[PDB]
Design an enzyme around this catalytic site. Structure first.
Site, PDB file in Angstrom:
ATOM      1  N   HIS A 185      52.744 -70.650-107.082  1.00  0.00           N
ATOM      2  CA  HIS A 185      51.629 -70.952-107.982  1.00  0.00           C
ATOM      3  C   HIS A 185      52.033 -71.690-109.268  1.00  0.00           C
ATOM      4  O   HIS A 185      51.806 -71.204-110.376  1.00  0.00           O
ATOM      5  CB  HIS A 185      50.865 -69.667-108.342  1.00  0.00           C
ATOM      6  CG  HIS A 185      49.417 -69.893-108.659  1.00  0.00           C
ATOM      7  ND1 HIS A 185      48.722 -69.120-109.565  1.00  0.00           N
ATOM      8  CD2 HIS A 185      48.522 -70.782-108.160  1.00  0.00           C
ATOM      9  CE1 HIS A 185      47.463 -69.522-109.613  1.00  0.00           C
ATOM     10  NE2 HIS A 185      47.315 -70.529-108.770  1.00  0.00           N
TER      11      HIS A 185
ATOM     12  N   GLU B  45      47.074 -83.059-107.087  1.00  0.00           N
ATOM     13  CA  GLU B  45      47.589 -81.957-106.290  1.00  0.00           C
ATOM     14  C   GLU B  45      46.695 -81.666-105.089  1.00  0.00           C
ATOM     15  O   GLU B  45      45.547 -82.080-105.056  1.00  0.00           O
ATOM     16  CB  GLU B  45      47.692 -80.699-107.157  1.00  0.00           C
ATOM     17  CG  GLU B  45      46.343 -80.209-107.679  1.00  0.00           C
ATOM     18  CD  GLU B  45      46.404 -78.792-108.201  1.00  0.00           C
ATOM     19  OE1 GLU B  45      46.840 -77.915-107.427  1.00  0.00           O
ATOM     20  OE2 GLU B  45      46.018 -78.554-109.373  1.00  0.00           O
TER      21      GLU B  45
END
Lengths: 89, 110
Positions: free
Chosen positions: B102, B73
């Site tokens: 998130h 990520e």
């Protein structure tokens, strides 16, 4: 710095993430999920950290494997290098 | 030196060069440069840098898993201060996803 979880008061996986949001001063956008927790424990939270999880078993009941999965993230973060102390009482 | 940190710019870059743009550094590296998350000083110690490249464990299983496939990520839209809630997710076989809430939900972009 210091975080406390009173297991007997956790009724859902939600109560837990929200209790963590407050106890760890997580960002308002906190995703309240395992990935968001990991990212917070390794890219936001302040160290050293002391997590005191009381009545773990009780909280394990009303959350399924949730409590254990949350605990796992803390444990890996610690193994990752994060200075976290976990007190399971 | 022209930072690439938007969803499409990074995705295109990951697919075209199979690596993140030069303005990315892992959490360990950032820390090696003096980064302290709780201080939100990434830009101070590493100007123009953004956190990205760390292994993504896809702990909720929301991303498609497969033997041999590892996810990573990277932060998107980050400039300075404390980290936002935007991330780009890329796999070893180059699948690209994104999240702006998130890690709550994801969207396949490549």
């Amino acid at each position: 710095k210091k975080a406390v979880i009173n297991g007997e008061q956790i009724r859902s996986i939600s109560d837990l993430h929200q209790t963590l949001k407050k106890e760890l001063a997580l960002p308002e956008y906190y995703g309240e999920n395992l990935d968001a927790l990991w990212d917070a424990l390794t890219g936001w939270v302040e160290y050293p950290l002391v997590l005191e999880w009381r009545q773990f078993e009780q909280s394990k009941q009303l959350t399924e494997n949730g409590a254990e999965s949350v605990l796992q993230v803390f444990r890996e973060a610690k193994a990752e290098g994060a200075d976290i102390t976990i007190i399971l009482s | 030196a022209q930072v690439i940190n938007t969803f499409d710019g990074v995705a295109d870059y990951l697919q075209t060069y199979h690596k993140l743009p030069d303005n990315y550094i892992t959490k360990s590296e950032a820390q090696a440069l003096g980064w302290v998350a709780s201080k939100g000083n990434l830009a101070d110690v590493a100007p123009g840098k953004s956190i990205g490249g760390d292994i993504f464990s896809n702990r909720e299983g929301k991303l498609p898993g497969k033997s041999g496939r590892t996810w990573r990520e990277a932060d998107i839209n980050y400039t300075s201060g404390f980290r936002n809630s935007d991330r780009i997710l890329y796999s070893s076989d180059w699948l690209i996803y994104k999240t702006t809430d998130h890690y709550q939900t994801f969207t396949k972009i490549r």
